[PDB]
Write a protein that binds this DNA or RNA. Structure first.
Ligand SMILES: O=c1cc[nH]c(=O)[nH]1
Length: 223
DNA sequence: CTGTATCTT
DNA sequence: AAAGATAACAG
């Protein structure tokens, strides 16, 4: 039992031996010696421990992990108790509130509830240097998350991809737009939320798309 | 008033 | 590549 959930490791292990991955892990290792890197090592792959890869139905793709102390824990936009929801998450909650009638602020920021239902909470970049947004971009993470997106794209069907922000949107070309649904909008951070995230209705839209594909909708309130 | 993207150069 | 300009609002 460890970092990678079994089904994910089984389908993503081929990346482990590739030079970019070995180099990526080396960079992250080196960074952790000189700076605080988020999330902690045992939580970088939390997104593989919530459900079987074949049970993924929705993929929310963010930019990179929260860069503040105690925030990031491996699920994009999620913070474990007792850490209060960061600005981005408060905005996600505000959107859910107007988008989903029954949605009410859960009193915490832990999104494991969605992840357990098949919502992959992935970030384009999986580690970040403390206090430096997107500091670990272009070091190899993108190729790894490309592998995750590619596998899902090729082996699943009717997945709903939620690409939040410019960086997450780089994965768009990797998805078969007829085989899957790709919804794109601005990143929920206060610095960009006003550019489309508010009013995007991605949560209700995701459920509509799921229902049309004959899949059970995500209970966004189940947190 | 300080901290939490996106576009342009 | 990296940083300036722009931007919106909570604590
Ligand atoms: O996990 C997170 C948190 C904030 N912003 C992101 O892109 N991802």
């Amino acid at each position: 039992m460890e970092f990678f959930g079994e089904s994910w490791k089984k389908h993503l292990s081929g990346e482990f031996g590739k030079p970019y991955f070995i180099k990526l892990m080396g960079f992250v290792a080196e960074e952790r010696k000189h700076y605080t890197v988020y999330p902690p090592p045992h939580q970088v792959f939390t997104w593989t421990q919530m459900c079987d890869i074949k049970d993924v139905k929705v993929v929310i793709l963010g930019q990179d992990p929260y860069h503040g102390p105690n925030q990031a824990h491996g699920l994009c936009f999620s913070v474990q108790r007792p850490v209060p929801p960061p600005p981005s998450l408060e905005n996600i909650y505000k959107e859910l509130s107007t988008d989903i009638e029954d949605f009410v602020h859960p009193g915490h920021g832990d999104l494991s509830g969605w992840a357990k239902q098949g919502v992959l909470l992935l970030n384009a970049v999986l580690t970040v240097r403390a206090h430096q947004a997107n500091s670990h971009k272009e070091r190899g993470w993108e190729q790894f998350t490309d592998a995750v997106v590619s596998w899902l794209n090729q082996n699943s069907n009717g997945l709903v991809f939620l690409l939040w922000g410019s960086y997450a949107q780089k994965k768009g070309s990797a998805i078969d737009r007829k085989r899957h649904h790709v919804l794109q909008t601005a990143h929920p951070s206060p610095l960009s939320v006003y550019r489309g995230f508010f009013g995007c209705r991605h949560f209700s839209k995701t459920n509509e798309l799921l229902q049309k594909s004959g899949k059970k909708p995500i209970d966004w309130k189940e947190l």
